[PDB]
């Protein structure tokens, strides 16, 4: 039936996700549980470890400032990656380019949180494409306002990872977030919602098939989607604060584009 078309949309989206995003949830878990004949990552738990492990850090000033800069570098690349994936969602590019922009602008932080969760466990986060592991206790222990920047993302991820979604689920879930017809300032809501409807059905079918064990994973996952909005509001604000209070720190242009007229 239509199931066939929905299945095919899921597989298109999975493949596009695989191309768009460098580190899959699958690999990240493998790393995180040592289930790989590949040396574990360089654990960064204090200032010493960070010094010893700054050679390993991906980045191309005090510690807290430097960590946030490294965290900011990777954020920009995530937006480049989410943007590429968005382009591949059937009929996203056919939308009005002003809406394409609106969707992404509100979408990315919700998806960044989603992505981070793939890279997190209760105690820390994978960094530098799984080559480093920065601890939660360490990030928490940073001076304010920086110490409380990642902790909300950790808090969401322990809850979100309980759902044990895989990459194939995540691909569709991400698409659903991007194509939200209820974003402030959309010019033409109707074709957005038409795609989202296809996507949501694709998602429901994926979740039923991939997890017959778990019923109302779909309902549970939709409830997370609504939390994540208000969780992203806190993050937006804390950044606007950090922009003003920390004069030494330059914030990346692309990032700034996304904080303009956000809440």
């Amino acid at each position: 039936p239509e199931s066939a078309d929905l299945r095919a949309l899921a597989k298109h989206l999975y493949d596009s996700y695989i191309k768009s995003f460098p580190l899959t949830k699958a690999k990240a878990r493998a790393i995180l549980t040592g289930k790989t004949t590949d040396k574990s990552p360089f654990v960064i738990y204090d200032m010493n470890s960070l010094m010893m492990g700054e050679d390993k850090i991906k980045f191309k000033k005090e510690v807290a400032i430097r960590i946030f800069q490294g965290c900011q570098f990777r954020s920009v690349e995530a937006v480049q990656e989410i943007t590429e994936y968005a382009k591949s969602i059937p009929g996203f590019v056919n939308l009005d380019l002003n809406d394409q922009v609106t969707l992404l602008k509100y979408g990315v932080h919700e998806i960044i949180y989603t992505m981070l969760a793939s890279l997190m466990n209760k105690d820390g986060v994978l960094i530098s494409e799984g080559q480093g592991f920065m601890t939660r206790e360490f990030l928490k222990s940073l001076r304010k306002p920086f110490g409380d920047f990642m902790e909300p993302k950790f808090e969401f991820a322990v809850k979100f990872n309980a759902l044990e979604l895989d990459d194939s689920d995540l691909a569709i879930f991400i698409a659903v977030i991007i194509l939200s017809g209820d974003r402030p300032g959309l010019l033409n809501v109707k074709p957005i919602e038409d795609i989202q409807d296809n996507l949501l059905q694709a998602l429901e079918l994926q979740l039923k098939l991939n997890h017959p064990e778990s019923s109302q994973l779909f309902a549970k996952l939709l409830q997370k989607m609504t939390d994540l909005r208000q969780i992203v509001t806190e993050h937006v604000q804390l950044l606007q604060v950090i922009k003003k209070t920390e004069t030494d720190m330059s914030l990346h242009p692309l990032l700034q584009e996304i904080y303009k007229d956000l809440y």
Binding site: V79, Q80, T83, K87, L97, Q100, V101, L104, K105, P253, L254, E257, I258
Partner: peptide
């Protein structure tokens, strides 16, 4: 929104 515009046009 130039960067975003540009990322979208590539």
């Amino acid at each position: 929104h130039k960067i975003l515009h540009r990322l979208l046009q590539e």
